Amino acid sequence: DIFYELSQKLIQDLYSKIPYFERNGIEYFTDTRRSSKRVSFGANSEISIIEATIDMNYKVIHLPIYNYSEKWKKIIYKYCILNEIHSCTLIKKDAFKGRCVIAGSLIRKDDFVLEYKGNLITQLNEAKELEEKYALSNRGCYMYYFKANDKNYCIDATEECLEFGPGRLINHSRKNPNIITKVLMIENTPRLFFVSKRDIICGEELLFDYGDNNPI
Template sequence: FSTSFTSFARGRRGVFRIYSETAPPVTPAVASVPPFCKIAFISEEKGRGVVATESIKANTVIGDYEGETITESVKDRRYLKSREAERDEEDHRWLASRVERGQSASGDYLFGVSGVDAFIDAEDEYFSNWTRFLNHADAPNCNVKSLPMGMSGKPRVWFVASRDISPGEEICFSYGDDYWIDDAEPVE
């Protein structure tokens, strides 16, 4: 099964700069980082990312992409400007909760899982884990895999090292061409 990474608000980089001048809060996503890597500020363009602190062997499963599992129609109401008017009370509560907790709502952390009407939204750091900080690279050192249903009964998306990774290297995967459709271009 293939999986696509989705962005709805390319160019809204402001959301990534909010924390760049002050220490970011230790959210559950930040606290979940495993011993073999750390979350670090990479650059103004990329924001934060994940850097290996230990050697990681090729084919190591490095982690699962965790977040809120939502349907395509919920995803569209939350993030598409053209569908904003269709938001129901729950959608409004969801947005207010993000704002209250200082969480962005850019739509840049969505994984569409093939074979099922499901997107994993890892934008909210209180409902996701460290893998939300993995940045894109054209020549990545890890691959992404997915299944429409894992042992939890929900879709499963996970990352596997595609080659040996050395301490100090940024851990990245390829978001795919569809992610960078608007004005923004990835940097290496």
């Protein structure tokens, strides 16, 4: 499916960051032109911390950010969302656990992991009808209902579009999740993303508790 094409994009991403991992003694998994969108930061005085925090050549979060204030984590998250920075992940298939998403290298606590990408649905009667259609067709359904900015939304990531990334494939755990969600309103549109709850080591599966009913 896209499962194989996505797995290759992720492997290629990993390959592009190896020189940076090796220079910095960071464990990773084994088995010319440049710019930033003006909308991805605020005042020009934010630029210094961003360029020190994120390596723009390899698109990695170079410095820890769990020590940054709320203001400055938001600045970093916003920047990663809009310039497509993400943690290094990989997909594994298996006869036992099915598909899963693992860390391709260390994910420090509070790092931006991945955006939960899909089609954003703002009318909930459209979402419920979509839900019924997927069930009737015996298709799976990767939909994420949430509340942000006092409004109800749904992100439908069911279509197998490479652009959605591997966020939608993360398995569920209430007992042992290692990521949580956050939302940033950017240009009037909620953007839903995962951040790590702690250091996630290389090879370790990403897990999320999909049952949290509270607002984000």
